[PDB]
């Protein structure tokens, strides 16, 4: 409760695939479509993906700038203390990567 609940309890997105909590974002959808949760690490820039079978519609997402991506849809949410995000962030400044193994796969 204190660490749990007072402390900085936070439901956060992880990529089940790369195990990060820092490389997810909400997609920005066309009007009428619904936003989804995606991993910037695990997905290809749309161009590069074409340059290597047909690509399904549910597999493309876009950001605010406008770039299109393929893949990176293996996300969920986990409950972590917020300060974990800060630590992970600082560590990546130092070139260090934390990789959280999430279950179920």
Partner 1 sequence: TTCQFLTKAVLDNEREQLDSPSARIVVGKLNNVGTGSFDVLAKVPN
Partner 2 sequence: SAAMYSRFVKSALDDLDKNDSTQIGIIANQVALPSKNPERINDKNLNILLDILSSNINRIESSRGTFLIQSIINFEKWWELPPHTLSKYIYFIKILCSSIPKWWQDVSMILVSCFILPIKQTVCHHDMLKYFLRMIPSSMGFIDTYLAKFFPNKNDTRRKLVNYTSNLLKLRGYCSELGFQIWSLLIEKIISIDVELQNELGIKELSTKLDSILTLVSTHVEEQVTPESLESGEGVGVFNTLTTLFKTHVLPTYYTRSIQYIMFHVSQQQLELMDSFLVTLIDISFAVNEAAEKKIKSLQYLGSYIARAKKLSRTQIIFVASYLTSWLNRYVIEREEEVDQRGGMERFKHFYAAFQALCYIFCFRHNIFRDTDGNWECELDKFFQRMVISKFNPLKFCNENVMLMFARIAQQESVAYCFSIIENNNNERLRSSWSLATRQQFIDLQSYFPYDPLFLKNYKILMKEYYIEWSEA
Partner 3 sequence: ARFIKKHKKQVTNPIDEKNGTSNCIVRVPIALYVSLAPMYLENPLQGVMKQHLNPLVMKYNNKVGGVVLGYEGLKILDADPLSKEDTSEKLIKITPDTPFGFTWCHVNLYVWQPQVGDVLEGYIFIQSASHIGLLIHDAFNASIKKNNIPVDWTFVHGHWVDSNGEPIDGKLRFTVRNVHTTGRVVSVDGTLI
Question: Residue numbers of the site for partner 1 (CB under 8 A)?
Answer: 3-4, 9, 79-81, 84, 87, 91, 96, 100
Binding residues for partner 3 restricted to 69-98, rule: CB under 8 A: 71, 79
Contact indicator for 10, 85 with CB cutoff of 8 Å: yes
Among positions 2, 6, 31, 96, the unique one binding partner 2 when judged by CB under 8 A:
31
Q: By CB under 8 A, is residue 94 in contact with partner 2?
A: no
Can residue 33 be called a binding residue for partner 3 (CB under 8 A)?
yes
Q: With b meaning 16 or more CB within 10 Å and e meaning fewer, what string describes 76-95?
A: eeeebeeebeeebeeeeeee
């Amino acid at each position: 409760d204190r660490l749990l609940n007072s402390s900085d309890y936070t439901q956060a997105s992880v990529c089940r695939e790369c195990g990060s909590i820092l490389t997810t974002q909400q997609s920005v959808p066309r009007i009428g479509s619904i936003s989804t949760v995606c991993c910037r690490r695990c997905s290809m820039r749309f161009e590069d993906a074409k340059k290597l079978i047909f690509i399904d519609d549910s597999q493309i997402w876009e950001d605010g700038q406008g770039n299109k991506f393929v893949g990176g849809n293996e996300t969920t949410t986990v409950a972590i203390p917020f300060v974990l995000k800060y630590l992970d962030s600082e560590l990546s400044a130092m070139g260090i990567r934390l990789r959280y193994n999430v279950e179920p796969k």
